[PDB]
Ligand binder design. Sequence first.
Ligand SMILES: O=c1ccn([C@H]2C[C@H](O)[C@@H](COP(=O)(O)OP(=O)(O)OP(=O)(O)O)O2)c(=O)[nH]1
Ligand SMILES: O=c1ccn([C@H]2C[C@H](O)[C@@H](COP(=O)(O)OP(=O)(O)OP(=O)(O)O)O2)c(=O)[nH]1
Ligand SMILES: O=c1ccn([C@H]2C[C@H](O)[C@@H](COP(=O)(O)OP(=O)(O)OP(=O)(O)O)O2)c(=O)[nH]1
Ligand SMILES: O=c1ccn([C@H]2C[C@H](O)[C@@H](COP(=O)(O)OP(=O)(O)OP(=O)(O)O)O2)c(=O)[nH]1
Ligand SMILES: O=c1ccn([C@H]2C[C@H](O)[C@@H](COP(=O)(O)OP(=O)(O)OP(=O)(O)O)O2)c(=O)[nH]1
Ligand SMILES: O=c1ccn([C@H]2C[C@H](O)[C@@H](COP(=O)(O)OP(=O)(O)OP(=O)(O)O)O2)c(=O)[nH]1
Ligand SMILES: [Mg+2]
Ligand SMILES: [Mg+2]
Ligand SMILES: [Mg+2]
Ligand SMILES: [Mg+2]
Ligand SMILES: [Mg+2]
Ligand SMILES: [Mg+2]
Lengths: 161, 193, 174, 193, 193, 193
Amino acid sequence: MRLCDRDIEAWLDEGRLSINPRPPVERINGATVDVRLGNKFRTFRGHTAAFIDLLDRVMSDEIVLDEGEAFYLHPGELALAVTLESVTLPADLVGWLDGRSSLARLGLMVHVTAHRIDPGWSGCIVLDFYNSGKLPLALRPGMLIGALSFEPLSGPAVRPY
Amino acid sequence: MRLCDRDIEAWLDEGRLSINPRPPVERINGATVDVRLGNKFRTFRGHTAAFIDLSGPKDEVSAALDRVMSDEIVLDEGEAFYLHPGELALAVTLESVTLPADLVGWLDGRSSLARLGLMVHVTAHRIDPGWSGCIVLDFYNSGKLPLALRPGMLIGALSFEPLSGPAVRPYNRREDAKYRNQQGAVASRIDKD
Amino acid sequence: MRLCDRDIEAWLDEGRLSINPRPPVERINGATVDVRLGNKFRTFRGHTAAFIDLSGPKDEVSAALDRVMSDEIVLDEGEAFYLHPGELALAVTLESVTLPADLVGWLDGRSSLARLGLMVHVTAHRIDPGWSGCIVLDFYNSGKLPLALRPGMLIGALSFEPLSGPAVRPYNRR
Amino acid sequence: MRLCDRDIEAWLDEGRLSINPRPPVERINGATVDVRLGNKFRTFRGHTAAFIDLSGPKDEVSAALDRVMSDEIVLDEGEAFYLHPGELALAVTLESVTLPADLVGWLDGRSSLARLGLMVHVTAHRIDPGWSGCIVLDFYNSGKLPLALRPGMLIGALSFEPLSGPAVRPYNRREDAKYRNQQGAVASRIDKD
Amino acid sequence: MRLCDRDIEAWLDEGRLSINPRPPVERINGATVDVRLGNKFRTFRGHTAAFIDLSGPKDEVSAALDRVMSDEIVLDEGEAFYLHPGELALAVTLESVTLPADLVGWLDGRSSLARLGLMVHVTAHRIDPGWSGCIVLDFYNSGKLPLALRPGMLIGALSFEPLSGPAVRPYNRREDAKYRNQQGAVASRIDKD
Amino acid sequence: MRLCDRDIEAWLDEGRLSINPRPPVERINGATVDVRLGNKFRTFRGHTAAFIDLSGPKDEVSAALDRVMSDEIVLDEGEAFYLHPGELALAVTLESVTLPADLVGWLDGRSSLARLGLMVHVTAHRIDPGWSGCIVLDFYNSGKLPLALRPGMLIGALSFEPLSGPAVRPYNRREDAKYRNQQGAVASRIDKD
Ligand SMILES: O=c1ccn([C@H]2C[C@H](O)[C@@H](COP(=O)(O)OP(=O)(O)OP(=O)(O)O)O2)c(=O)[nH]1
Ligand SMILES: O=c1ccn([C@H]2C[C@H](O)[C@@H](COP(=O)(O)OP(=O)(O)OP(=O)(O)O)O2)c(=O)[nH]1
Ligand SMILES: O=c1ccn([C@H]2C[C@H](O)[C@@H](COP(=O)(O)OP(=O)(O)OP(=O)(O)O)O2)c(=O)[nH]1
Ligand SMILES: O=c1ccn([C@H]2C[C@H](O)[C@@H](COP(=O)(O)OP(=O)(O)OP(=O)(O)O)O2)c(=O)[nH]1
Ligand SMILES: O=c1ccn([C@H]2C[C@H](O)[C@@H](COP(=O)(O)OP(=O)(O)OP(=O)(O)O)O2)c(=O)[nH]1
Ligand SMILES: O=c1ccn([C@H]2C[C@H](O)[C@@H](COP(=O)(O)OP(=O)(O)OP(=O)(O)O)O2)c(=O)[nH]1
Ligand SMILES: [Mg+2]
Ligand SMILES: [Mg+2]
Ligand SMILES: [Mg+2]
Ligand SMILES: [Mg+2]
Ligand SMILES: [Mg+2]
Ligand SMILES: [Mg+2]
């Protein structure tokens, strides 16, 4: 059971849920809220290590782009990024990050199987971008990148985030 | 709450939800309806552009997209589409799906295909309330072998979830919705953003 | 409606939902249970075939998959499985899961691992009502570094959704 | 012994060796002649076949090759071919080269291109005694960035080695030679083996 | 100076150079002898190790090599080895070659195979004076399609270059030479450095 | 004709050819001198640019190259550079080489490294008459495993070939030569074309 657009907006009014900045009415529709891309990226530098045992001589310094700059996501490359919006969920809501079909049709994955936003989460969401396509994708802060949907839990989470 | 098999049948009978052609009972079980592969495909031509500027000027984006997308591939009967490792291709479900304003659908792949590397979507798997049409698939082969895909094969599964109420802005009424009544392997319309 | 953590423990206590071995409460938070990695693996050997025809049942499974798979790789502890970028490997969860006819399950990854490119499924992530057993994992490394994986590590997260009613053709019947 | 720049000029003056159009003095130095990129290309269409059986039955091989090779791509002036990382493409030199029976030629790339990942051949770089024609290039981009290739750019270098004597079976006289008088981006003729 | 066809035959007749089995006149032309593919192969098993420390402690390097190399694959008659894009595999020439102290040899691929992406070596293509044995090939498919390789196919070419004099330390006399009298698809012996 | 080990030693004694530091006798055999890996490296930063326009406007090319090339990496003693499959990196030989106007040099890899997928060049492997300096290596790992590279390891081999006479336009006298007296892991200077 997902919250329809009208109940998403009612939870935003009520302060049960908060998304800041708040997307316009045009970006809240069906069972989803459209979310945009922020301005902090990282990439991986493999020459420093042979492997990781499942930490961070391998990550770049945070990359913040100048106005009018794009991050170029090349095919076969994983990059970390953030949502522009901060999201705060109550103890009885779980959220689910999904991509956009327009971007999937060019090969952009906006996550890599972890896509659950936990009850009690508060913060911008970290994105793991992967370009499975043939062409480099120029990514710019502020672009629509995904969508979030919200599922109420059976009851309130005892151990929320 | 997802609809169990029995309730999917009841929504289909009531005409709330439609899937055309309607799958037989054998294809509806648990909490999912199996869907089949259509016969329209599209590939990418990288040599004609350096990149795609996703949120660039509409006319530039549009011209880049038209350069990189192949024409639609239609397979005869007996023909396979060979999906090579590392290649992304667009395909389409045989079935058209129509959802009412108070239901959302979700596309998943099949474990039998996944174990060979076949991804049937690339993180966009939601079918919106008010959707009507064939579903475009973005296949990616993450395995070690080419996979021969044939029209009519079972390619994924759809599940359905009731919304908390009817959507106020369902897909069929949204003025800026890009993919209303989509029929073949439709390329990205990111230029309409 | 996902089951929340307290409601996950209830269902386990009832005994229709079961995970064997039973995870400690430390592993059950919010609306998910963390699951662990088993010690059975499979890789592919490309050199014995040109392709696989996915239009099928069972003729592939066998005459295909069986012929392009490794024998089963069982690791002694102290040993790692090295998952190299761009390689797909088959693994299995440590725990066996049994679902009743009125519940569907869903395997997700862990954000901590996904940030390094670990994909724990490849679009098929639904555990059906009536399902009984260890879950097969299809791992894929989308990152830039090999990842060492060790039997027993926390590898993913399961969440659970009640069905609208009990399924009529559940996995054990079908 | 390779011919030094002075001797390459003497062989060209004597008409022993020909390169058409003849490069200017600025392109002939040390032990090499710099060559330029032509404007014909070819790519591969993988989705039409599972594999190529190199020493299989001639008619099956031939049909597979005709399926997988694109039509010839001809670039206008102003146009680039975009060579993406991991992609193999065929191209052709601007120059036609004719060798006598007592000389062998060798194609190399340029360090400036190599340091970006551009390979101009794939382990076949010998130009046989008796050869006459344009040279087909198999480009592979082993780097991290797409490379815009434009007709007319400097793409590699040829050097030349006298043989111990004139070849008895030079290329122009061999009945089973596959590539005599080649002109565009000619695809593999492995089916003629 | 490379030996022309006629002089290759003269060196073979004189027993200065040997190639066993001796290729027929049809395979010796211009400045080269065509060589054929043997029936022994080796692949790599990545899952057993994180990396190879090339100049590490000998025992650690040796243990890593033994873990990553497959057992020798021997093809029956009729059987193909399928070389998929992006895969490196070891193979061997059908012919054994023996060089005297005053000759060096050079392995090239074939343009017909190169045009499909097949590299027959990975920047090591010298056959040393005093060499005796079958030649190990490191195949890499840089193309878009799997290639079916069959024993006995023509895979490459050898040319031969006189040295300025006889080598004082030819391969057959060097104590630390690793690959003397190699016969199957011998894996790297970098651990002997 | 390549110089045999004995003549390489004579050319070095005569000061015709220089290699600094001079390799010991154990590293000079057959027709080659073994060379060793230096301790400077450079990688690529793809996220800063969409592509490189090889024969575009000089200032655009120059700005793109400055964006995509890393700063020089210098490894301490004990440190390895990890070269992952599919990655291209720039490195340098430990040795500086100086060639006279009548000699050309040729860089090859090692069979031991090739059997693990290490390419030490990307089709540009000529050292010109009049060259003086350390040689930049473009490493590519075509194998399945990361390779740990350490400064000082044996990485390849140089051979030498007399020219038909002294070059009139050797590298040290060419005004437009791009890489005279190169010392570290120098990036492509394709912008100087
Ligand atoms: O794999 C998919 C996923 C979705 N759809 C359809 C159903 C869905 O209702 C519609 C829009 O999906 P989404 O909102 O992801 O796409 P968008 O790129 O945001 O398009 P829009 O601008 O119309 O929302 O596309 C497909 O054809 N294939
Ligand atoms: O794409 C994602 C996915 C998740 N998260 C956040 C929201 C979620 O509530 C939290 C934890 O996710 P998960 O439980 O998957 O991470 P973990 O690896 O288990 O770490 P933890 O120990 O924090 O539970 O990470 C993101 O920011 N981006
Ligand atoms: O990553 C997964 C996903 C699913 N399953 C199990 C649970 C699920 O209930 C069953 C069947 O899944 P699915 O319907 O995706 O498989 P299929 O390929 O359609 O096979 P079947 O014909 O058995 O339904 O497989 C796994 O072991 N691993
Ligand atoms: O792997 C190599 C190959 C060459 N060189 C040096 C020696 C050679 O003499 C010089 C120039 O080589 P080339 O002519 O192939 O490079 P270019 O791009 O043509 O530059 P230029 O215009 O200076 O000739 O660079 C290297 O350092 N590394
Ligand atoms: O990069 C190259 C290499 C060679 N050739 C031409 C010149 C050479 O003289 C001829 C044949 O080369 P090769 O003998 O390597 O080709 P093959 O596949 O063996 O063909 P054939 O049966 O004609 O010898 O092809 C090219 O056009 N491009
Ligand atoms: O593709 C090849 C190239 C060479 N060789 C043989 C012939 C050559 O004379 C010998 C040694 O080659 P190289 O010197 O390149 O190998 P190494 O790694 O340096 O070994 P060594 O320490 O024996 O010199 O290996 C092959 O079998 N296959
Ligand atoms: Mg949308
Ligand atoms: Mg199923
Ligand atoms: Mg967690
Ligand atoms: Mg040059
Ligand atoms: Mg030939
Ligand atoms: Mg050696």
